[PDB]
Every structure is written in C-alpha cells, then in structure tokens.
Amino acid sequence: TDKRKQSLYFPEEMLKEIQEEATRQDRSLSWVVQQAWKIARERIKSFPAVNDVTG
Amino acid sequence: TDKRKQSLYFPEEMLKEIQEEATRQDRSLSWVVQQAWKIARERIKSFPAVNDVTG
Amino acid sequence: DKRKQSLYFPEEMLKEIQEEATRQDRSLSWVVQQAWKIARERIKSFPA
Amino acid sequence: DKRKQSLYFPEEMLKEIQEEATRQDRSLSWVVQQAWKIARERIKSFPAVNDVTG
C-alpha cells in the first residue's frame, strides 16, 4: 500500500471531470481516482472474462 | 475526448488489482480505470463539498 | 489458457508496441498476440 | 537498447513461438520481434476501433 506512480491516459472531458471533483473536495487527482476504484472494484471483478469461453 | 496522459499514484495492492483486471479482459490499465470512473462518477459528483458550509 | 513470458525489446520497438496498444485501448500482450497471428506464415516459411 | 517486458500468451501460441525459435536456433524474443516487424504496418493502418475519427 506504499504509493506507486503510474501514467494513465484519459479523454480530455473525463480528465477535466476528475480534476473538478478533486478541486471540489480540496483533494489530489489520485485520491478521486482511488475512491472511484473502491466504488467500481466489485462490478468490474464480477464481470466475466469477455474473451475466455469459461470467463 | 482526444487522449491525455496523466501520472497518478496508487497503493501497490490497488495498482496490482487494476493490472490483474486489465489483463483478465486483454485490456489497457487506462481502460479499466476509465470504466471505474463511469461506474463511480455519479456517487462522487453527488457527494457534497466536505469542507464548504453550503457543499 | 494464458501463460506469462518475459521477452526483450529495443526501447524504440517497445514504445511502438505500447502506442499501438494505447490506440486500441488494449494490453501489450494483445497487440503482440495479433502480430503473431499476422506474421505466423512468413516466420514458419523463412529458412532453418 | 533492449528492455525486458512480461507478456501473456495462450499456451498453444507460446508453444508455437517456442518451436519456431528452436527451428531457427533463435531466441523467443527474436521471433516475436520479427513478427512485430512483419505485422507493424497492418496493425498501424487498421483504424482506432473505438474512436469515431479512427
């Protein structure tokens, strides 16, 4: 859980939205993205492997 | 919506989980994080500004 | 069923593979897999 | 100058790569690099499948 730097790419519109959400809570970009992963984690892990027959 | 590169920081455990989710769908890291934002966007935007009296 | 293999690439080629992966919102492994499928026959043909 | 990268392969495809490497007294990395050189142009020419402008 020690921090690791990772470069990602975003559509400008999505990045802008993430930036405004960070600013609104006096928070870092990475923080808002981390909270989004905590909210989404379970839907994303539960979805089957789309290209694997067994999934 | 043209792509923009942004460096973020993650706890190693969360990054590892994002990486395994990307791999499982033969997908990029940025893609899995984008799908998480689409899922979380609405909870995060709806939450009041925690430090602003009016929020 | 998937198996992990470490390979070596010249930095320029790796960068090119990465930009192709990014352009299709795809993983590195995916781009390389599609390249094998495309090249398989030229590779099998060229001499021993 | 070279970089090590971990990749994932279906066992059948990896096995095929391995047999091709052996047949030419070549490394795995070499055969995969030659496959990129051959495929590069088809792959770059194919449009961005998710982008309207492509």
Side-chain angles (χ1 to χ4, degrees), chain C residues 13-46:
Chain C
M13 182 184 271
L14 168 295
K15 187 190 165 199
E16 195 169 42
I17 297 168
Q18 180 57 80
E19 60 188 64
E20 282 320 305
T22 297
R23 191 173 68 92
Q24 297 297 11
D25 307 305
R26 231 81 219 196
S27 80
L28 294 180
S29 299
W30 184 90
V31 166
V32 172
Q33 285 167 38
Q34 302 325 319
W36 179 252
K37 294 176 204 173
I38 293 159
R40 224 193 295 94
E41 290 333 300
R42 284 69 173 293
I43 294 15
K44 288 193 172 161
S45 77
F46 63 44

Side-chain angles (χ1 to χ4, degrees), chain B residues 36-51:
Chain B
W37 183 252
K38 296 178 206 170
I39 294 156
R41 291 184 58 255
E42 46 261 62
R43 278 210 215 292
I44 295 183
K45 291 165 80 72
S46 324
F47 213 81
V50 130
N51 312 126

